[PDB]
Design a protein around this ligand. Structure first.
Ligand SMILES: [Zn+2]
Lengths: 262, 336, 227, 66
């Protein structure tokens, strides 16, 4: 008795390998595609072509909830970038066709669900498609900065992110027609004290890409293959005191002597 | 040889199957020659996209000339851009004692009004059903006679057509398949576990030669796809078989697995050849054996460190997204 | 054109013996264009068989070539002088020994196992990104028999053989080991290039010494400890 | 890189492992095993088994002379 000769003429379909544990519910699979920007973005991302260095790819947000004012729950999250696999070895998708409630009795494993029906005629298996294009997330996540307690970031999120008209009027009416102190800290304008911030912080907003490389660099503790030595202890502490006497006085009061690393 | 792939498909969902009316009368005026419901309007368009996605598309389509069958092939003919021919030989079955009468199908001249440019007349029928209806024995003999004549007409009327689509009826589909395989009667099972050719709404089969003119009567046909219905948003419905007494139309916990064929290098892609066939044994075991064309393979059961989502609607209101998590990684095997 | 298998075998014979595709001499074997159609057809052909097909050709050639030398069906000087005609005639005369149909499977799992005793078988940024995207990370749920004791004991023979050959009237550690196993291990080490053999003196190949000398940088750890 | 030389060592090992050597002999010959005579008032030593076999065969010849 020969084993059934199934077709491989089948449709070729795209795939997405998420570095997430997506449960079987519609709510879960829906939330997962929303983290990538919706089904339009995912389908478009499979159609990108050209040198891998240039591909914009798909952007994944690990935090993407929405607050009561409709603003993003984590404005500023730099995304995990995914790209199409350059050479995806083709694989066949098989449909396994169990009786109702077989999967749960087998601790949700398909292996055990096959083995627990070894002699049955009910358990159909058939090939359904070949996959030959896949997006994988594989580069590191960028440096993340938290703006939850930065005064100007809260004013921006609660206006330009919420689209609330009361907040938007209050915001634009507060923007000076001309700024007389562009040299001074923005905290002098934004009075709000509900947030702990030091006056040494200028509320400088963070850049859209901090790690200019998605993969770790090859330092490997190797040097690249491609004079204070004469000074006295008093001369060295005097040079430090030229910029800040506090560190110089602290050093003189504590240290016993310099050493050249030779 | 020219004809090397035969496709057979059941017509769409009939208007008389709905839970409530008003049920529309046959526009062709012939008894029981009813129109396709909205389910048939959608599902015939699905099958057109599905056949367009396969890298082995038909080059000619033969309809049983009933209105429901020609209506089913109309979107196929439009979207695939292929010629349609009548063939009454693949016609419906009616038992001899049918009341009030045995219906006879409409002709090209009137069908041309309902199907302008879709249908074509450069093919007369290979043979035709008895006007007094048919016993199941005479019915099966009709299909047994049909096949060796039909292919010898197709391969001479057309010089190079290799793949053909038949659009037809539940009894006809099963009888055509069983006779193409050569069984003594169409009520037999394909195997001792009791499988039969399925025949639900829009259900499709594929028959192919195993791996100069050789008689069609000498060639052996393999049933390589046997009631494929994945491309239907409502799945297979209204399934029927010769075990049913009545004439046709009057809990499945599915999971998905990926079988991967990793190549021993990163700068290259493992490609599955176009005309290949899959066989397996032992999925119940920790080392299943798989055939993919010329090469044998042995697996290993593995769980993915993440979740893989596949989008079948995105082939080369709702998406049929598959979750993939268990995998069978295939290592090569040397026969000894 | 029909000699495409002769071209594939000539690429295998040259790249296996001389470590490179000796195109200059291959051109003198099967008459074709000066390099171009040979190089184009070879390059087109390999992509249809991949690394899996290449290994099938290499493993078969290695097996035929050791059997041929074991039975003296060629004189070693003809291999060194690269007599492609004789070398290709070796595979030719060996392929005449067997024939088969493309395989098939039985529906019962056990029946296949009864019928057949099937045999199992640093770079730039963009190259790292390419490689890292192709890999799949998977947790093994099950496989073939573990066979741990035989594998462990076989590796214990590797340990004891290596521990002899690395520096220096009895051996104690192999006393309890079956006398049949030692043959397999010394043979495997020869195939894996780990050993050489004078008329009755084994020696380790420089790979074991060099891997220890390069990866075992203890003189540097000594400097780090002082610092 | 020494491919024909490696084939020569490999096939020569396979020949010698068929020429009655247990493999453990090739190990023992590196480890320091000299063979030694066992006959009455003989004590001579050999660094290969063939030379030991010849020496014991010379003792069989001595028994035949006697
Ligand atoms: Zn002696």
């Amino acid at each position: 008795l020969i084993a059934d000769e199934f077709t491989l003429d089948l449709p070729r379909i795209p795939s997405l390998e998420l570095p997430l544990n997506v449960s079987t519910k519609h709510s879960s699979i829906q939330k997962a595609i929303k983290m990538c920007g919706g089904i339009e973005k995912v389908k478009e991302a499979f159609k990108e072509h050209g040198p891998i260095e240039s591909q914009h790819g798909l952007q994944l947000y690990l935090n993407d909830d929405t607050d009561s004012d409709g603003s993003k729950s984590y404005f500023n999250e730099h995304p995990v970038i995914g790209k199409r696999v350059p050479f995806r070895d083709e694989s066949v998708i098989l449909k396994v066709t169990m009786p109702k409630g077989t999967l749960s009795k087998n601790n949700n494993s398909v292996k055990d669900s096959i083995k627990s029906l070894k002699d049955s005629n009910k358990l159909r298996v058939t090939p359904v498609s070949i996959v030959d294009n896949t997006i994988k997330f594989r580069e590191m996540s960028d440096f993340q900065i938290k703006l939850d307690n930065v005064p100007s970031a809260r004013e921006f999120k609660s206006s330009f992110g919420s689209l609330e008209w009361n907040n938007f009027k209050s915001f634009v009416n507060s923007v000076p027609d001309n700024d007389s102190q562009p040299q001074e800290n923005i905290g002098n304008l934004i009075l709000d004290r509900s947030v702990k911030i030091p006056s040494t912080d200028f509320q400088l907003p963070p850049p859209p890409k901090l790690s200019m490389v998605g993969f770790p660099l090859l330092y490997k503790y190797k040097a690249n293959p491609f004079d204070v030595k004469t000074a006295s202890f008093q001369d060295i502490i005097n040079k430090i005191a030229k910029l800040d006497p506090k560190t110089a006085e602290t050093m003189k009061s504590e240290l016993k002597g310099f050493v050249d690393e030779v | 040889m020219v004809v090397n792939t035969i496709y057979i498909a059941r017509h769409g969902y009939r208007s008389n199957w709905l839970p409530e009316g008003p049920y529309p009368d046959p526009l062709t005026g012939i008894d029981s020659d009813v129109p396709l419901a909205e389910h048939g309007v959608q599902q015939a368009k699905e099958l057109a996209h599905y056949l367009l996605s396969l890298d082995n598309q038909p080059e000619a389509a033969f309809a049983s000339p009933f209105y429901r069958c020609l209506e089913t092939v109309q979107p196929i003919a439009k979207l695939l851009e292929i010629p349609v021919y009548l063939e009454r030989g693949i016609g419906e079955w009616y038992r001899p004692d049918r009341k009030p009468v045995i219906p006879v199908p409409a002709g090209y001249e009137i069908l041309s009004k309902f199907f302008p440019g879709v249908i074509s007349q450069e093919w007369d029928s290979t043979l035709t059903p008895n006007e007094k209806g048919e016993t199941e024995q005479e019915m099966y003999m009709r299909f047994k006679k049909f096949w060796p004549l039909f292919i010898e007409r197709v391969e001479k009327e057309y010089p190079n057509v290799e793949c053909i689509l038949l659009v037809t009826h539940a009894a006809s589909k099963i009888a055509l398949g069983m006779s193409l395989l050569g069984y003594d009667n169409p009520r037999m099972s394909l195997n001792e576990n009791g499988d039969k050719i399925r025949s639900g709404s829009c259900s499709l089969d594929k028959y192919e030669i195993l791996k100069t003119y050789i008689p069609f009567s000498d060639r052996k046909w393999v049933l390589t796809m046997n009631g494929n219905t994945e491309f239907l948003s409502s799945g297979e419905e209204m399934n029927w078989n010769f075990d049913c007494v009545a004439e046709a139309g009057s809990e499945v916990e599915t999971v998905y697995i990926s079988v991967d064929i990793p190549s021993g290098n990163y700068k290259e892609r493992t490609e599955i050849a176009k005309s290949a066939i899959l066989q397996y044994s032992g999925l119940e075991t920790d080392a299943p054996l798989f055939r993919i064309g010329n090469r044998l393979y042995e697996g290993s059961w593995e769980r993915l460190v993440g979740t893989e989502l596949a989008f079948p609607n995105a082939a080369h209101q709702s998406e049929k997204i598959y979750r993939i998590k268990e995998r069978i990684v295939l290592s090569n095997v040397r026969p000894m | 054109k029909d000699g495409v298998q002769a071209l594939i075998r000539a690429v295998v014979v040259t790249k296996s013996i001389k470590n490179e595709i000796m195109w200059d001499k291959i051109t003198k074997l099967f008459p074709n264009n000066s390099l171009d159609n040979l190089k184009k057809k070879w390059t087109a052909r390999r992509v249809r068989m991949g690394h899996s097909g290449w290994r099938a050709y290499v493993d078969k050639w290695k097996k035929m070539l050791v059997l041929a030398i074991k039975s003296e069906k060629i004189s070693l000087r003809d291999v060194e002088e690269l007599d492609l005609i004789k070398l290709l005639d070796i595979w030719t005369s060996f392929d005449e020994k067997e024939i088969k149909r493309p395989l098939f499977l039985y529906k019962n799992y056990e029946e296949n196992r009864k019928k057949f005793t099937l045999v199992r078988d640093m770079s730039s940024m963009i190259q790292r990104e390419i490689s890292s995207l192709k890999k799949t990370y998977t947790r093994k749920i099950s496989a073939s028999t573990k066979d741990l004791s035989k594998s462990q004991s076989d590796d214990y023979i590797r340990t004891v053989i290596r521990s002899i050959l690395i520096e220096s009237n009895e051996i104690e550690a192999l006393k309890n080991v079956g006398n049949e196993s030692i043959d397999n291990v010394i043979m495997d080490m020869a195939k894996e290039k780990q050993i050489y053999l004078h008329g009755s003196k084994l020696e380790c190949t420089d790979t074991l010494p060099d891997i220890l000398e390069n990866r075992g940088n203890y003189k540097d750890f000594g400097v780090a400890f002082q610092y | 890189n020494n491919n024909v030389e490696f084939l020569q060592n490999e096939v020569d090992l396979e020949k010698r492992l068929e020429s009655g050597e247990n493999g453990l002999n090739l190990l023992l010959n590196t480890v320091g095993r000299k063979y030694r005579c066992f006959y009455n008032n003989c004590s001579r030593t050999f660094k290969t088994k063939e030379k030991y076999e010849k020496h014991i065969d010379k003792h069989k010849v001595h028994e035949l002379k006697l």
